[model samples]
Target: HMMKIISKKYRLELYSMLVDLLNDNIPLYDALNKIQNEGVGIYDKNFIKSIELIKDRMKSNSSLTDALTGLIPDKEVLMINVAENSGKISSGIAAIRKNIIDAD
Candidate 1:
C-alpha cells in the first residue's frame, strides 16, 4: 500500500489504455508504445527499457515472456506469459493494473 504515493489518475490511465486495446485488437507492444507516445508519464528508464525489450522480443522469434523475463527480474513477466497463453493479455494487463492500484 506504500505505493499510494503514485497518483490514482496515473494508474487509471494505464488501465484504461490496456482496456482499450482489448476491444481494438491492437498488438500488445503497440499498445505499450502508444501509451508511451501519448505521455503515460513513465519516469523510470528501466520501465522504458522493459517495454522496448518486450516489443523487440515480440518482433523476433523469442517468446514474449522469455524476452520480458530477460529484461525484468519480477513476476510481471510470468503474468504476461499467462495472459499470452490464455489469449487475454489486454484483460490481464488491465486486471494487474487495477489490482496494483487497489493494493495501494
Candidate 2:
C-alpha cells in the first residue's frame, strides 16, 4: 500500500476513534488506554506512547494542545502553528483530515 494512504487512513481512523471516545465522556487517557489494549495497528502503538506523554502533561496541568505538541513531532510545528494563529486547536486536526482527503 502507498504510504500516503496508509498514513492518512490510520490518522483518520484514529482521530475518529478519539473523537468518539472523547464525545462519550471518556477521559483522554482512559480512552487511549482502551484503544491501546484493544486496538491493533502501527499507529495504535504510536498513539499509546503519545497518550502516555499526554497523561503526564495532564498531571502537570498542561493544555491539550501542549500535550499533543509534545508527542507529535512532525505535526507539532504545522498544527500548533496554525492553532496558535486561529485560536482553535480542534480546527487544526480537522484541517489535517480535510487537507489529506482533499489531496487524495
Candidate 3:
C-alpha cells in the first residue's frame, strides 16, 4: 500500500481471468499469453507489458514468485505468492479474486 502505485482495474480483471482460466486446468503461461492477446490495447498496455515481463521472468528462473517482482503493486503478488510457495497455482488464484476489492 505504501510503495506501489498501479491499477485496481487491471488487478481485478486479472484475478478473475485466473479464476476462470485456471479453474479449467489451464497453465499460467497461457493465462498470461491469452490475456495479452485478448486485451484491448485497451486495458492500458502496461498490463500487457507486465504480462510479457512475467512470462519472460519465469523462463528466466526462481520462476514464479521472485521473478514476478517489480510487477504489480505486488501486494496481490505477495498474496498469490504464498500459494505458489505451496505449488498450487489454482489455489493461489482463487483467494486473490475476492480480497483484491478490499485490498487497497
Candidate 4:
C-alpha cells in the first residue's frame, strides 16, 4: 500500500471520475455524495472525509475549487481557477480532467 497525503494517480482518477459523471449528466453534489457514501471500501478514508466537507461547501455556492480546497493540490486549483473565472464551473471541471490528463 502507498500513501502520502493523496496520491497523484488517485487524484487524477478522481478528476476523471467527476468529469465522467458530469458528462453523463450526474449532478456534482450527487456524484460526490455517492462517492463519499460508497467509496470507503476502495478509496482512502480521508478522501471520503474531504469529499464530505467539499459537498457542504458546494451547497453554499462557493466555487468548485473553493469546495475542493483541501482535496485538491495548489497547482490544480490555480489552473481550475482560470476556468472558474471563465464562468464555467461545471464545464471547467471537464476541461480540468482533459488538461491534467494530457499535461501529466
Candidate 5:
C-alpha cells in the first residue's frame, strides 16, 4: 500500500454503500465484491487492498467498522462504532450521508 488517496466524495459514497449493504446483512467481502463487479467507482488498488485488509480483520472477528478505522474519517468511525454497539447503524449511515451532502 502506497498511501492511496481517495476523494471525499468517493469516501462518502463508499461509506454509504457499506452502511446499506451491511444493514442488509451482506458480508463485507461480498459487498465489496459486488461493488467491484458493478464498477462502483472503487476500481482501484486501494479498494482491493482495503478488501484484503477487511478480510484479514474479519478472520479475527472484528466488526466492519473496526476494519475500516484508518481508511475512513474519524466521525464516520464514531458513527459506525455507535451503530455496532447500539444496533442503529442504518440511522448512523443516513446521518453520515446527510452530512456529506450538506458539506458538498
Candidate 6:
C-alpha cells in the first residue's frame, strides 16, 4: 500500500477534530466513526480506507494508537501510543494539532 503523506493542515484539522470529540466525552470509536462519515471530503480513498480499518480494529478492542500504526505518520502514532497509555489521548492530539499549527 502506498502511504499517503497527509498535509500539515489536514493533520492539524484531524487532530483538532479528535481532540474536540474526545473533550466532548465521545468515545474514541464513535469519534473516529463520526469523522469517517462526516468529516470534510479532503482525504483520499486510501486514507479513508485506513480509517475504516482502524475502526474495525477498534471494534475488536485494539488501542487507537495500535490500530493507527502503519496508517498515519510514525511520529503521530508514537505520540498517540504514549498518550493512550498515559490516559491522555485528547491532550496528546491537541498538542500535536498545536504543534502543526505553530509550524505553519
Query: Comparing candidate 5 with candidate 6, which one achieves the higher TM-score?
Result: 6
Where does candidate 6 clash, by residue pair?
none
Model 6, 1-104: lDDT tens digits are 55455656556666777888999999888888888887437667755665677677666655777677765678888888899889998999887777767776
The TM-score values for the models, in the order shown, are: 0.58, 0.51, 0.73, 0.64, 0.65, 0.73
Cα lDDT of model 2 by residue, 1-104, tens digit: 11112245556665667666766777666877787777656445655655555567667765665555534446544675676568654456566666667878
Candidate 1 residue lDDT tens string, 1-104: 11112234544555577689766988766787986666536445544544555566678747777655544335556787888899987777777676677778
lDDT of 3 at 104: 63
| lDDT at 67, model 4 | 62
Candidate 4 off by > 4 Å:
1-6, 85-91, 98-104
Where model 2 places Cα greater than 4 Å from the true spot, the runs are 1-10, 40-47, 53-61, 73-96
RMSD of 5: 3.4
Give the clash count for model 5: 0
Q: Model 5, stretches more than 4 Å misplaced?
A: 2-6, 19-25, 40-61
**Order of models, best lDDT first:** 6, 3, 5, 4, 1, 2
**Residue 22, candidate 4: C-alpha displacement in angstroms:** 0.4
Best by lDDT: 6
Task: Write the residue-wise lDDT of candidate 5 on 1-104 in tens digits.
Answer: 44233457666767788778978988657887777677636467666556556566666655868675666677877887887789776677778788888987
**Least accurate stretch of 10 residues (summed lDDT) in model 6?**
1-10
What is the model-wide C-alpha lDDT for candidate 1?
0.63
Q: Where does candidate 1 clash, by residue pair?
A: none
Choose 1 or 3, whichever is better by TM-score: 3
- For each candidate, what is the lDDT? 0.63, 0.59, 0.72, 0.69, 0.70, 0.75
Better by lDDT, candidate 4 or 3: 3
RMSD of each: 6.4, 6.4, 3.8, 4.4, 3.4, 3.0
Backbone clash pairs for candidate 2 read: none
| Cα deviation of 34, candidate 4, in Å | 2.3
